[PDB]
Symmetry: C2
Subunit: 375 residues, 2 copies
């Protein structure tokens, strides 16, 4: 109402202007970086304004769980490293007069630091409601603009001193910061089975020209990973009948779209291509199990958030480490993986949009499972 409604119009207009200019390169345009820098400083200038204006603010579950801030800080450090490498390679290829190109790393780092500190300190459950509402939503647009900026950049990344140390963790940072700003804007007025999966999950990462068996080892572990989660979550779904947070549900269901799309694109490619090798069947089973475990785990968490009881503790403990080993490969891995052969045929654009949502989903899942385990 009023300023609250006006802020969204300001947010979408900044976003829509950015989104149009994000795809400037495909139109056959480096002016996007200048726009990206401009919104970063102004958002940062509001943050530093707020960091001293927060004294005026008569502040006051709702404060935001620890995992949010932890992931925020971690991915902020990752963005710091990313922009350090960026400015390093820019200074290595120092020739063009354009400065916005080298300013974007520095301004991005400054923005990351100030936003991280501000979100860390003020996430706890005021005054200047007109400016703050227009301030938080403007910062929301900046995170989404740089997110879609990075998505396009790595999508077209295919085809000297930076050693191509690309870190898509900035995308994960933008989503983590966006939800943290969202919640603040809303209040303006024997489980040892998972342990064995840690070693084998890391061993294949250490292990990974590839052999036919190497694909099987990677897929078989993944298949038995989701296959176990498909039935323990189903086991958790049937035991809840014995013992019978809007944004949490939206984030859980919403982030699941990332894994749904890649799996659905995988099964479509598998059936259309109709391969005869075991690789196609492995892909089909892996994607189907991914979708099934995602749906069942989502239902389990949604129902949960609304001796004997130790049974549900073990599976939640089991899925806790099982999810973590499922997050290592996306966070640290290769998007054009050898696992997908018929899908890459390049589909990296689909992977870039989708994988961070799965990474986002994993962090929400483990925190939710930990939340009900201690309860």
């Amino acid at each position: 109402k009023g300023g609250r409604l006006l802020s969204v119009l300001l947010a979408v207009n900044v976003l829509l202007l950015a989104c149009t200019l994000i795809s400037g390169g495909a139109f056959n345009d480096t002016d996007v970086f200048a726009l990206l820098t401009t919104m970063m400083l102004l958002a940062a200038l509001w943050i530093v304004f707020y960091l001293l204006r927060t004294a005026r603010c008569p502040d006051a579950a709702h404060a935001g769980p620890i995992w949010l801030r932890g992931g925020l800080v971690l991915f902020g450090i990752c963005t710091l490293v990313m922009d350090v490498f960026k400015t390093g390679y820019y200074s290595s290829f120092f020739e063009c007069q354009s400065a916005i190109k080298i300013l974007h790393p520095i301004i991005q780092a400054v923005f990351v630091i100030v936003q991280t500190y501000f979100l860390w300190i003020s996430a706890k459950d005021h005054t200047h409601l007109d400016l703050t509402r227009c301030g938080l939503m403007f910062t929301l647009a900046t995170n989404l603009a740089i997110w879609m900026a990075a998505v396009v950049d790595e999508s077209v990344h295919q085809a000297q001193q930076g050693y191509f140390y690309l870190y898509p963790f900035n995308i994960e940072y933008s989503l983590f910061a966006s939800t943290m700003l969202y919640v603040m804007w809303k209040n303006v007025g024997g489980p040892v089975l998972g342990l064995l999966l840690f070693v084998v999950g890391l061993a294949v990462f250490i292990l990974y020209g590839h052999t036919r068996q190497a694909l099987v080892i990677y897929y078989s572990f993944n298949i038995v990973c989701l296959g176990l989660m498909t039935l323990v979550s189903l086991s958790g779904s049937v035991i809840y009948r014995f013992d019978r947070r809007t944004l949490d549900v939206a984030l859980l269901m919403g982030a699941a779209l990332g894994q749904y799309a890649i799996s659905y694109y995988s099964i479509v490619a598998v059936v259309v291509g109709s391969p005869r090798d075991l690789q196609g069947a492995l892909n089909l089973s892996h994607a189907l199990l991914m979708i099934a475990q995602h749906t069942f785990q989502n239902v389990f968490i949604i129902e949960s958030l609304h001796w004997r009881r130790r049974c549900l503790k073990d599976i939640s403990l089991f899925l806790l480490l099982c999810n973590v080993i499922l997050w290592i490969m996306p966070a640290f891995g290769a998007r054009p993986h050898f696992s997908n052969t018929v899908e890459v045929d390049l589909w990296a654009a689909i992977v870039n949009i989708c994988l961070p949502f799965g990474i986002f989903y994993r962090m929400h899942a483990v925190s939710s499972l930990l939340e009900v385990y201690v309860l």
Copy 2:
């Protein structure tokens, strides 16, 4: 909760499977039409099941305004004509054994008829909550799947007896049916200035190789069209200070994204191209006025839905016909219009996604303005 939550997972899975298969042609795939037909019949089979199961239902502003059903029926008739032309040209080029190609028109027509009648009769503000919730959301997926099917089809339409009578009104039908199903799912448990614009708006449509003045006449009328709306809505915004529905706001703001994106893409193209002719300045002014009038009208409607008073009656009356003449050109016109020259350079894909939202926005606007005028 429970079946209500399970339905959305069913809806998105059908949608996501469809969305992946919607873009099958670009992957270098007519199996999408078979999938489109399959979900249509099953959704239709639920409708005819519901049309006799509604007797069991103990039914009971919330019933849905008249404009929704009216647009639904109109665009359903348009879809009937479209599929009639489709099956006609298919029977004209009758050679391939594939039947799904010719079945899709007939099944689409049957689905349109049954869905139109069902939405017309049961939109009024039960039993079988498990099936109905999974039924409405399944129908929601079918409308969105065919919407994105049509969007891609006309996007790639560029480059004998059907005479290419393409009717994008099916897209408008899908959005109209989707919101009608959405609201049902939520409740499971001197203004003569506009008159002059009618003639000039139709005259240019009758008038429209083109001349330089022809572009000016088309743009000047559009500029003075929005320019008047930019200040009367502003006039309506300042008089509301003298005299000081969630889904309505979302639809109004959400449908505005269509006109925002094309205008924002226009201004980006205008400034980047930097043309010297009056055409570029006309485009820039037209798009800026579009964005400004959209924002101001949205704010005016949002505030409104929450002698002397005759002043706001006239402007709402003025915008009533002013919006209508602004809906004729998108509903009946050419997407690669001569107005955009630097933008087409082909950007028809952007136009196809965006214009129906403006058409949707216009219908919501006129109904809302009529709603407050009678009040």
